[PDB]
Amino acid sequence: SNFLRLSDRTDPAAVYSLVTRTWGFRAPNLVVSVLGGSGGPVLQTWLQDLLRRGLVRAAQSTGAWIVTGGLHTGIGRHVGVAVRDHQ
Amino acid sequence: MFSYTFGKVQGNSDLYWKAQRYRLIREFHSRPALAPPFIVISHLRLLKEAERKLLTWESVH
């Protein structure tokens, strides 16, 4: 699990080049960034189902990247678990 | 009465045959390899995360 610590004021070009070349992640056919605090560690069942079904199925069919808060809580955790399930 | 019975189990002939196929295969899959008359010697010879992944795949489908 490639983990990198970098300064906030960093040009995205270098980061993208690093990810694409050094780490071997192929250029995505799509990128989706999820937003929202999603108050409460446990989220709405309908919301969880919508996310894990729709977004993850779309990513699987297209082979995309998903960018979320790398935190094991709330929406980030739900995205992670759904992605692992579909993998 | 015979004709009615026959017609009843004629539109589903394939289903009945498939069930019988399964029963036969199950019966003969666990039998000694030798035929009865010689089967005496065979009788004497007689004397996880994977499941998690599988269930997740099933649920996805």
From Swiss-Prot, chain A:
ATP 2 binds at R84. Phosphorylation by PKC leads to increase the sensitivity to Ca(2+). Widely expressed with a high expression in intestine and prostate. In brain, it is both expressed in whole cerebral arteries and isolated vascular smooth muscle cells. Prominently expressed in Purkinje fibers. Expressed at higher levels in T-helper 2 (Th2) cells as compared to T-helper 1 (Th1) cells. Expressed in keratocytes. Calcium-activated selective cation channel that mediates membrane depolarization. While it is activated by increase in intracellular Ca(2+), it is impermeable to it. Mediates transport of monovalent cations (Na(+) > K(+) > Cs(+) > Li(+)), leading to depolarize the membrane. It thereby plays a central role in cadiomyocytes, neurons from entorhinal cortex, dorsal root and vomeronasal neurons, endocrine pancreas cells, kidney epithelial cells, cochlea hair cells etc. Homotetramer. TRPM4, is a temperature-sensitive ion channel, it adopts distinct conformations at different temperatures, markedly influencing where and how ligands interact with it. Decavanadate (a positive modulator), ATP (an inhibitor) and Ca(2+) bind to different locations of TRPM4 at physiological temperatures or at lower temperatures. It is linked to Progressive familial heart block 1B: A cardiac bundle branch disorder characterized by progressive alteration of cardiac conduction through the His-Purkinje system, with a pattern of a right bundle-branch block and/or left anterior hemiblock occurring individually or together. It leads to complete atrio-ventricular block causing syncope and sudden death. Erythrokeratodermia variabilis et progressiva 6: A form of erythrokeratodermia variabilis et progressiva, a genodermatosis characterized by the coexistence of two independent skin lesions: transient erythema and hyperkeratosis that is usually localized but occasionally occurs in its generalized form. Clinical presentation varies significantly within a family and from one family to another. Palmoplantar keratoderma is present in around 50% of cases. EKVP6 inheritance is autosomal dominant. Belongs to the transient receptor (TC 1.A.4) family. LTrpC subfamily. TRPM4 sub-subfamily. This is Transient receptor potential cation channel subfamily M member 4. It comes from Homo sapiens. The chain holds residues 88 to 174 of 1214 of the full protein.
